[PDB]
Amino acid sequence: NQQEIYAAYRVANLLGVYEDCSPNGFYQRWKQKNAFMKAQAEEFGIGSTDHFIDDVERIVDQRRAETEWKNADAWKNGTAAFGARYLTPEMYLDYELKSIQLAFATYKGELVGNHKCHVYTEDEKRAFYDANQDLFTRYHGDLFSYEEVDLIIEKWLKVQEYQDIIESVVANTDNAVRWITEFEKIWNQMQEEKRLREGHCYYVSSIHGDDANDGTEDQPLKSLYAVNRLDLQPGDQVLLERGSVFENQFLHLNVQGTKEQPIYIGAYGNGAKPLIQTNGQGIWYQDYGNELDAPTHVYRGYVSSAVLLYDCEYLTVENLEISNKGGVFGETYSAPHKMNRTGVAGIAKNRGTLHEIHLSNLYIHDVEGNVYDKHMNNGGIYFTCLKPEAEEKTGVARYENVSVRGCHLKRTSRWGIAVGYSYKCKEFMTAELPDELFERYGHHNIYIADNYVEEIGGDGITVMYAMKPLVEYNSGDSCALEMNDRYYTEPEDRAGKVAAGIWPWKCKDALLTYNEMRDMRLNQDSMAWDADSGDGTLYQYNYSHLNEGGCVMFCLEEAIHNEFRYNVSVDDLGGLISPSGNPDAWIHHNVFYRRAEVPFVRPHMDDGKYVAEENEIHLI
Ligand SMILES: CC(=O)N[C@@H]1[C@@H](O[C@@H]2O[C@H](CO)[C@H](O)[C@H](O)[C@H]2O)[C@H](O)[C@@H](CO)O[C@H]1O
């Protein structure tokens, strides 16, 4: 709320987080950040997909072939461009609120204004450990030792002290009314600037429409059910009116454009993005048609999805707000078989390769999916491939030329953004992954960029079964919030109580670059980066800060040909690198800032093979 924002900037001013903690100060930092990214970031992947999506694999090869640290001096002096290249007002406000909280969590000063900063004693931190054992078990139920979580407990206690100061300032509320009044005007201006930056045409208006209308702008349709019944054709557009709220509704589409005449779903008019408020409706039946990589993963069942793109092609969906809240009768939040829920679900099944599906500038929040299930279409955005009715007739279900750009996810469970999990998973159960597997079964030209993921129950961003995916210029914070026994109460036989930030699964020669991940929430994993099972993963030019499981993992015997170079890690906790049973990892020409009592190699995930050389390791 407005009083909490006011309070946060009062604390920012006392900590010296920003020079100008007025509403205008906020506006100017927002404009400066967006201008900086526009001036300094790479240009590839900005603007219309038709100008770049066929070149993803080429630009990946060019970047993988780099022989020196691009703009090393900016990286090393703290002026490099990374994370999302455009921050919406909502992304940017949340980014700064997280910055202020983390600055409190690391402040060493005696006072914040008249607040005496508490010094957490060993007895107090041990008391918290003994009272919160459900936060400190690992994948197999074994406890982190107190010594392994001491500094994390201190961070958590300082974050709670920060949150208590905010509630104190809210309770004690003159120049607050002034600050809030000006902020409201600044916010409205920022919304106008964001909005400016944005076949048959069908118009839908929840307020003004009628489903008996022809769907022109003057006589728009009323509901998404009417859209679900349209025989959309190549070149058609469906435009949902800004200010619309589609209560309990959903968009479930099975439509194909062409390359020359794609279909477009987007917004028209003035005001807030149209809101698809699915509230647990929008039921469909998911069935992969065979067991997945582990026999315990759930692979069939009903799913609720706000947007379902079922065998769609040559379709862009843009400028929608989506939620998918549960809370139906009989349901509890951590129930073992709570329904899987998606914001946007993509499915390939009966059309072989699906081409040219693009998501853009979606705001997806409060998707309350099953806490546990990893590969149902469960989370903010989840694209999967199911066994075809008749693969010999219609071909392998898979993706080509697919992008997810400029999306803001907040409070989605389980996944944030996941693209590519396939019924063909058992074809990839070797360490080395020949290109032929991707030619037959895998995805091509997959591009995930300029997204913002925050407050995610599980993993932030994952790409699966793709050749040379490019995952870049994404910002994340505070993922893996539910990967602990307090929320992960009834896993049954599914295990899976782990998450990392932004990572590839069973990809070939993936490139993850120019990403930013902060404040991952403790679990056995909880690092920013994860060269997981797959072949050739490269991370370069990524920024990580205050992740509770450290900087980067190399996970087990099928995580092969891993390289980690030209990254910056600032005050990651637990331990910087997690080479856990991996066969190789080349970790070179990075910069790490670690506390003396945070080890370079993380405890219990230290028995893999790696070459660490030419790294700059600073003590802080
Ligand atoms: C090899 C391994 O244990 N990797 C872990 C990941 O778990 C795998 O994730 C894939 C995702 O497609 C499948 O679910 C597979 O069955 C799992 O073994 C885990 O998701 C990540 C992040 O926490 O790290 C490893 O723990």
Side-chain angles (χ1 to χ4, degrees):
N1 65 47
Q2 290 174 315
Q3 290 185 62
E4 286 174 322
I5 293 165
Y6 167 73
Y9 282 99
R10 283 311 84 212
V11 173
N13 177 55
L14 295 170
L15 288 171
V17 177
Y18 309 115
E19 288 180 351
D20 180 1
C21 292
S22 68
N24 183 54
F26 175 70
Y27 178 75
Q28 296 303 332
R29 284 192 307 274
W30 177 67
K31 297 279 284 178
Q32 161 186 62
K33 171 62 173 183
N34 284 329
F36 170 74
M37 293 307 289
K38 181 170 176 179
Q40 298 306 328
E42 301 299 291
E43 290 193 7
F44 183 81
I46 302 288
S48 292
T49 55
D50 47 23
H51 304 147
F52 72 81
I53 191 70
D54 288 298
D55 297 329
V56 165
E57 297 191 3
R58 171 173 69 87
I59 223 90
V60 166
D61 289 333
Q62 289 180 5
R63 289 179 176 186
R64 291 175 64 79
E66 292 180 44
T67 54
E68 66 180 276
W69 190 330
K70 180 182 179 75
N71 295 331
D73 291 352
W75 273 99
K76 286 176 184 187
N77 76 13
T79 62
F82 54 71
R85 286 170 298 185
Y86 175 83
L87 286 291
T88 65
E90 296 87 354
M91 287 174 190
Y92 194 67
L93 174 61
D94 286 1
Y95 183 91
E96 286 211 341
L97 293 173
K98 174 56 56 164
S99 296
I100 299 163
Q101 181 195 78
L102 301 178
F104 190 91
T106 55
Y107 183 65
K108 300 142 179 300
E110 183 194 33
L111 299 171
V112 173
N114 297 318
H115 183 272
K116 296 162 169 93
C117 294
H118 192 277
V119 173
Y120 295 93
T121 69
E122 177 171 3
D123 283 348
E124 287 167 335
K125 293 180 292 185
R126 283 183 182 279
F128 179 94
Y129 182 89
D130 289 334
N132 294 276
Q133 297 177 281
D134 59 342
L135 298 184
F136 298 122
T137 55
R138 300 175 68 247
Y139 187 90
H140 290 292
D142 53 300
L143 284 162
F144 285 113
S145 73
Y146 167 74
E147 291 77 13
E148 281 158 4
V149 295
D150 166 359
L151 294 187
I152 294 160
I153 290 169
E154 180 190 40
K155 177 190 176 197
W156 291 352
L157 288 174
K158 285 176 77 79
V159 164
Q160 183 59 60
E161 183 181 352
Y162 171 75
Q163 285 166 358
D164 293 350
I165 289 162
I166 300 301
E167 82 185 13
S168 177
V169 176
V170 174
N172 289 357
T173 294
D174 35 342
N175 67 359
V177 147
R178 185 155 317 112
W179 196 104
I180 294 165
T181 303
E182 216 7 67
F183 187 83
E184 260 171 2
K185 297 176 178 151
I186 287 290
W187 186 260
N188 288 334
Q189 188 180 330
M190 292 176 61
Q191 293 294 322
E192 292 177 348
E193 292 179 24
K194 165 182 47 162
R195 286 162 199 178
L196 255 174
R197 143 182 185 101
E198 306 307 310
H200 203 72
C201 289
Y202 297 93
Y203 291 81
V204 190
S205 171
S206 68
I207 295 173
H208 301 299
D210 188 310
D211 287 341
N213 291 350
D214 56 16
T216 61
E217 185 170 1
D218 287 314
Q219 303 193 285
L221 303 172
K222 195 178 174 64
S223 78
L224 301 185
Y225 310 126
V227 176
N228 293 340
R229 291 189 304 261
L230 287 177
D231 183 17
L232 296 178
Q233 300 296 123
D236 285 356
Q237 304 191 30
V238 180
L239 304 176
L240 308 185
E241 202 182 10
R242 287 178 172 274
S244 296
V245 178
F246 304 101
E247 181 182 11
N248 287 45
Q249 303 186 26
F250 51 90
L251 210 55
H252 285 194
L253 298 181
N254 172 52
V255 300
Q256 307 83 36
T258 63
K259 179 171 179 173
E260 198 165 304
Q261 290 181 291
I263 295 171
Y264 180 80
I265 315 293
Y268 79 104
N270 299 293
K273 289 172 183 178
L275 170 60
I276 308 180
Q277 187 189 78
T278 296
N279 296 324
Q281 320 303 308
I283 302 308
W284 63 282
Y285 188 73
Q286 181 169 0
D287 183 359
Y288 275 93
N290 55 70
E291 291 185 354
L292 308 184
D293 76 271
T296 53
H297 295 315
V298 174
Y299 66 94
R300 54 205 174 180
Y302 282 91
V303 179
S304 160
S305 302
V307 179
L308 174 64
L309 308 182
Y310 203 104
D311 276 333
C312 297
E313 310 194 57
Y314 301 102
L315 180 63
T316 294
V317 179
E318 184 170 56
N319 286 332
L320 312 182
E321 184 172 326
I322 291 160
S323 64
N324 195 4
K325 293 176 174 186
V328 298
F329 282 99
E331 186 179 278
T332 68
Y333 184 86
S334 290
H337 300 297
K338 189 172 76 179
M339 193 173 294
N340 282 279
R341 303 198 169 98
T342 356
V344 183
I347 290 294
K349 186 181 172 176
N350 284 135
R351 295 183 65 85
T353 303
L354 298 186
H355 303 79
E356 297 280 358
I357 306 164
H358 302 289
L359 307 183
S360 172
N361 300 341
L362 310 182
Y363 178 30
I364 301 170
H365 56 89
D366 299 291
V367 173
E368 298 182 352
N370 186 279
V371 160
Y372 312 90
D373 291 332
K374 291 181 78 188
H375 302 303
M376 304 288 283
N377 288 233
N378 183 51
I381 294 171
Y382 212 135
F383 281 34
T384 64
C385 310
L386 311 182
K387 186 183 176 177
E389 187 73 27
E391 182 171 309
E392 79 281 4
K393 298 186 197 153
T394 61
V396 174
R398 59 187 175 142
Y399 292 109
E400 182 174 300
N401 288 26
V402 169
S403 71
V404 177
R405 299 188 302 157
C407 295
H408 179 182
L409 282 60
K410 180 174 188 183
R411 294 188 303 264
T412 74
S413 299
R414 172 175 165 146
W415 231 282
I417 300 175
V419 178
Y421 203 89
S422 175
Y423 72 108
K424 287 300 193 187
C425 54
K426 295 172 281 202
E427 302 299 336
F428 297 81
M429 287 185 334
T430 51
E432 305 213 37
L433 299 176
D435 292 350
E436 187 189 313
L437 292 177
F438 300 85
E439 299 171 0
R440 290 176 64 92
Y441 310 124
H443 317 306
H444 293 82
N445 294 329
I446 305 304
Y447 186 69
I448 301 172
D450 295 321
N451 307 287
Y452 196 102
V453 301
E454 58 163 325
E455 319 292 6
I456 308 301
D459 293 271
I461 303 176
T462 312
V463 59
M464 304 113 158
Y465 300 110
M467 170 63 65
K468 290 168 188 177
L470 179 52
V471 180
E472 71 169 2
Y473 289 111
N474 302 285
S475 299
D477 70 70
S478 317
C479 302
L481 295 190
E482 292 169 346
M483 303 294 100
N484 58 71
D485 289 350
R486 186 161 302 169
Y487 301 93
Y488 211 84
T489 59
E490 297 186 49
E492 299 181 356
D493 63 349
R494 294 167 290 197
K497 195 191 70 191
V498 273
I502 298 174
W503 58 273
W505 170 256
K506 290 296 188 174
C507 297
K508 185 66 173 287
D509 298 344
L511 179 60
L512 306 95
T513 188
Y514 301 110
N515 300 290
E516 176 173 10
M517 170 60 67
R518 310 187 297 167
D519 191 36
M520 290 289 306
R521 192 70 57 260
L522 185 63
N523 65 83
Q524 166 160 323
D525 294 345
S526 65
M527 66 292 300
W529 318 125
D530 174 16
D532 210 294
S533 305
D535 186 341
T537 291
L538 175 62
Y539 284 89
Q540 64 183 16
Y541 315 135
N542 305 278
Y543 180 93
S544 61
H545 179 53
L546 274 173
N547 297 291
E548 296 167 4
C551 178
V552 59
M553 177 166 66
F554 307 88
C555 193
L556 288 169
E557 65 281 347
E558 302 182 355
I560 195 161
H561 304 138
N562 314 112
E563 186 171 359
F564 189 87
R565 67 185 186 198
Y566 316 147
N567 303 288
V568 174
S569 162
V570 179
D571 210 11
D572 287 318
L573 299 180
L576 300 196
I577 69 160
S578 289
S580 184
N582 61 295
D584 70 82
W586 191 16
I587 309 169
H588 74 273
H589 297 95
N590 305 281
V591 177
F592 300 93
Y593 294 82
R594 66 177 186 75
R595 301 173 194 189
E597 292 304 301
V598 173
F600 187 66
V601 185
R602 187 155 174 253
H604 327 307
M605 340 261 267
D606 57 351
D607 62 6
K609 302 302 189 44
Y610 61 94
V611 174
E613 64 185 2
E614 301 296 342
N615 298 118
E616 191 180 304
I617 305 170
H618 289 74
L619 300 186
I620 59 154

